[PDB]
Amino acid sequence: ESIGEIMGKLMQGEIGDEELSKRIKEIFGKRLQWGYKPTHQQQLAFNLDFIKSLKEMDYELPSAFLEAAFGKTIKQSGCYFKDETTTIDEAEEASHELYCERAQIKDGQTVLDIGCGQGGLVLHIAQKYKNCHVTGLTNSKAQKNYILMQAEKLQLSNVDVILADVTKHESDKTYDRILVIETIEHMKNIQLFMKKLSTWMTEDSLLFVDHICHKTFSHHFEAIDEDDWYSGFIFPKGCVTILSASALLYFQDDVTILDHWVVNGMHMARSVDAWRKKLDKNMELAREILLPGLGSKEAVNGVITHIRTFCMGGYEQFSYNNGEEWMVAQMLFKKK
Amino acid sequence: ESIGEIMGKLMQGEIGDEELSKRIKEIFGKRLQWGYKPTHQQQLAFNLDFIKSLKEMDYELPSAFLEAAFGKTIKQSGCYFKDETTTIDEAEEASHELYCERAQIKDGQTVLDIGCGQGGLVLHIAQKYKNCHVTGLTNSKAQKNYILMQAEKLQLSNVDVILADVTKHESDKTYDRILVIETIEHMKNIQLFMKKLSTWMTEDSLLFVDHICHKTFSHHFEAIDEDDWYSGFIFPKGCVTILSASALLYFQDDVTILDHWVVNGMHMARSVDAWRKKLDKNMELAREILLPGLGSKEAVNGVITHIRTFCMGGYEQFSYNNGEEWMVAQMLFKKK
Numbered sequence: 001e002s003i004g005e006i007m008g009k010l011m012q013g014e015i016g017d018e019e020l021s022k023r024i025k026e027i028f029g030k031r032l033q034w035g036y037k038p039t040h041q042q043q044l045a046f047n048l049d050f051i052k053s054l055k056e057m058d059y060e061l062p063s064a065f066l067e068a069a070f071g072k073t074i075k076q077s078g079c080y081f082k083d084e085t086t087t088i089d090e091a092e093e094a095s096h097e098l099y100c101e102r103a104q105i106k107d108g109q110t111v112l113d114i115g116c117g118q119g120g121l122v123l124h125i126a127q128k129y130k131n132c133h134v135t136g137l138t139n140s141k142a143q144k145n146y147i148l149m150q151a152e153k154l155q156l157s158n159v160d161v162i163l164a165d166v167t168k169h170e171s172d173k174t175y176d177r178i179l180v181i182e183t184i185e186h187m188k189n190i191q192l193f194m195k196k197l198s199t200w201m202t203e204d205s206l207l208f209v210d211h212i213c214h215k216t217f218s219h220h221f222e223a224i225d226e227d228d229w230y231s232g233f234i235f236p237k238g239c240v241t242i243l244s245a246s247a248l249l250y251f252q253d254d255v256t257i258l259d260h261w262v263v264n265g266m267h268m269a270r271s272v273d274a275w276r277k278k279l280d281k282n283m284e285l286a287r288e289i290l291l292p293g294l295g296s297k298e299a300v301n302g303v304i305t306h307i308r309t310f311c312m313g314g315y316e317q318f319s320y321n322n323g324e325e326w327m328v329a330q331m332l333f334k335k336k
Numbered sequence: 337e338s339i340g341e342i343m344g345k346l347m348q349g350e351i352g353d354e355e356l357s358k359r360i361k362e363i364f365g366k367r368l369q370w371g372y373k374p375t376h377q378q379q380l381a382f383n384l385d386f387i388k389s390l391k392e393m394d395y396e397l398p399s400a401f402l403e404a405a406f407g408k409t410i411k412q413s414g415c416y417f418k419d420e421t422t423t424i425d426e427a428e429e430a431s432h433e434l435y436c437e438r439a440q441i442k443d444g445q446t447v448l449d450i451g452c453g454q455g456g457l458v459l460h461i462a463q464k465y466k467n468c469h470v471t472g473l474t475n476s477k478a479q480k481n482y483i484l485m486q487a488e489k490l491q492l493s494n495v496d497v498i499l500a501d502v503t504k505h506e507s508d509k510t511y512d513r514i515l516v517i518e519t520i521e522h523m524k525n526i527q528l529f530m531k532k533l534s535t536w537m538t539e540d541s542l543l544f545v546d547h548i549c550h551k552t553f554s555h556h557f558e559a560i561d562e563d564d565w566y567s568g569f570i571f572p573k574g575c576v577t578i579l580s581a582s583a584l585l586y587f588q589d590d591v592t593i594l595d596h597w598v599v600n601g602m603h604m605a606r607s608v609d610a611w612r613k614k615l616d617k618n619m620e621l622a623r624e625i626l627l628p629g630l631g632s633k634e635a636v637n638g639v640i641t642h643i644r645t646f647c648m649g650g651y652e653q654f655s656y657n658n659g660e661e662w663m664v665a666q667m668l669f670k671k672k
């Protein structure tokens with residue numbers, strides 16, 4: 001069976017969930033085979049080669065659709081589920097609280113959220129800590145607009161948003177706290193990224209990074225072989241990197257580690273499951289919302305298939321071996 | 337059975353090798369049970385707690401005996417065995433060559449060897465690189481004397497030895513290369529140690545560290561429980577720390593990592609096996625050598641039992657799971 005053939009049936013909704021999940025799990029299984037080495041000697045050689053290679057490098061969905069698919073604050077990162085019955089809205093809030101705890105946020109601090117998305121964390125910190133000034137930075141005008149509208153509705157006076165490609169942003173401004181929640185995976189050059197972040201810190205600042213990871217090895221999110229129809233469908237341009245849980249420890253030229261955690265992958269699995277189920281529940285509404293801006297029922301079905309498959313695939317990835325393969329890494333740093 | 341009882345039979349040579357190896361393997365087995373956590377979340381919590389705890393802290397055998405037990409240069413660190421038939425003398429040289437390769441030694445450099453022991457590496461570099469100046473640093477007068485005698489016999493003019501407790505040594509001198517071969521395991525405060533080493537480097541220097549490790553977790557070399565007669569017999573004062581293979585990545589306040597390797601534990605296992613077998617072969621001579629300085633056959637038997645048991649135990653430790661538990665970690669750093 002060719003890619004063309006599988007992609008044919010997928011787009012037509014002719015692959016049932018059972019088969020789809022099975023096919024994607026197999027693809028992730030091959031990545032694990034690729035990544036695990038027989039000895040720690042070989043594992044470190046593999047991992048350091050990856051790390052060295054990084055050092056050589058360098059239409060938007062309507063907000064109504066996003067609201068029908070994601071949780072209340074449209075968080076687009078792994079959330080944290082205390083209970084079986086925890087809702088996605090509760091899991092968003094719990095995840096925001098965990099970041100505030102681990103990044104040691106205190107009232108009165110200046111806070112920068114890099115790649116802030118729809119601004120759930122910016123709005124959380126602004127509401128919880130009235131004397132903080134909170135700045136989100138995003139490369140999306142639509143996201144900036146959404147955040148400023150929400151801050152207005154919430155009567156928040158302590159929020160601003162920088163519209164910038166972070167890789168190009170130049171400023172003399174420093175911040176007490178810099179937060180990077182699942183943004184670093186999108187970064188082309190990571191030695192240069194951490195260096196830039198360090199110039200926006202003082203000796204009193206902390207930097208908190210959260211990134212999807214594998215516990216043992218790093219990889220680009222790209223086709224494992226010629227049979228892999230999934231990876232390139234999800235990221236057809238690519239430029240998503242899955243660092244190992246310890247990869248950023250090798251990027252301490254300009255910052256120094258203070259603490260290090262991981263969150264088991266079942267939290268991410270439950271996040272993507274909640275998105276998939278909500279999209280499914282709101283399927284008719286979603287198709288209605290998208291149609292104006294996409295111009296045909298076929299183009300709508302395509303966008304929806306892509307998002308739904310991303311959630312179905314993410315479920316297999318992060319739930320693999322009960323959350324003990326792909327998971328979320330978190331690190332706290334100070335400036336050199 | 338009490339410790340007193342096992343120690344009774346051990347000292348009397350009443351425990352055969354088979355039983356001795358079995359008992360020590362069991363003790364290491366319990367350490368593995370202690371150290372491996374069920375989830376990566378818990379493994380990192382365990383490992384970071386250990387790392388944080390470190391940040392809060394702060395008669396000699398005649399040379400003729402050492403010559404009868406160890407290899408030609410009296411190396412007292414893991415060696416490197418290419419073949420089944422590689423001799424300890426060859427393995428010493430191979431290990432010296434590996435350090436020179438990984439620490440990027442070049443003729444003309446100033447080189448400092450911290451905790452240089454009987455000076456095998458100092459003498460190797462001095463002979464191979466005639467324009468290097470090579471300084472060994474040791475806290476032992478007997479070791480200093482041995483090295484200077486060997487340098488004289490070898491017609492080396494480029495060797496000096498500092499007699500100092502490294503934790504107390506103050507100097508303005510800097511070096512192109514600093515080498516630390518299985519010395520850091522003896523260090524009380526490691527943030528402070530790496531900081532001190534950094535003040536002896538310039539922007540052009542490199543630091544190479546080799547340390548015994550476990551691939552997954554860190555531990556002090558101390559009794560696992562009340563049944564453990566071994567750990568405290570080997571190190572009755574203690575102050576040996578077995579860092580995980582990645583522990584020093586968290587000690588980059590003052591230096592920055594460039595490369596990272598591990599060497600499989602079978603190399604160390606073959607090293608301690610060679611020492612044990614050579615001591616066994618030369619047992620009569622060894623007892624004769626020690627008697628003058630120890631003053632009784634009983635005190636001689638004690639010293640020999642301690643050294644032999646150390647080798648028997650080391651064999652079980654490093655050969656465990658074909659060298660994939662305890663092994664040797666190596667790191668290359670530059671100054672911040």
Ligand SMILES: Nc1ncnc2c1ncn2[C@@H]1O[C@H](CSCC[C@H](N)C(=O)O)[C@@H](O)[C@H]1O
Pocket residue numbers: 074075076077114115116117118137138139140164165166167180181182183186
């Ligand atoms: N170069 C760049 N400059 C600014 N933002 C960028 C960027 N590359 C990616 N981003 C943004 O970073 C975000 C990563 S997704 C995570 C969004 C948000 N932190 C949340 O947790 O929900 C996306 O909004 C992405 O478009």
Ligand SMILES: Nc1ncnc2c1ncn2[C@@H]1O[C@H](CSCC[C@H](N)C(=O)O)[C@@H](O)[C@H]1O
Pocket residue numbers: 410411412413450451452453454473474475476500501502503516517518519522
């Ligand atoms: N505070 C200190 N100052 C100097 N040397 C020390 C020290 N603590 C331990 N040492 C020495 O460091 C050495 C560790 S054993 C390794 C010796 C040598 N590098 C080799 O590979 O053979 C021992 O000689 C030990 O006595």
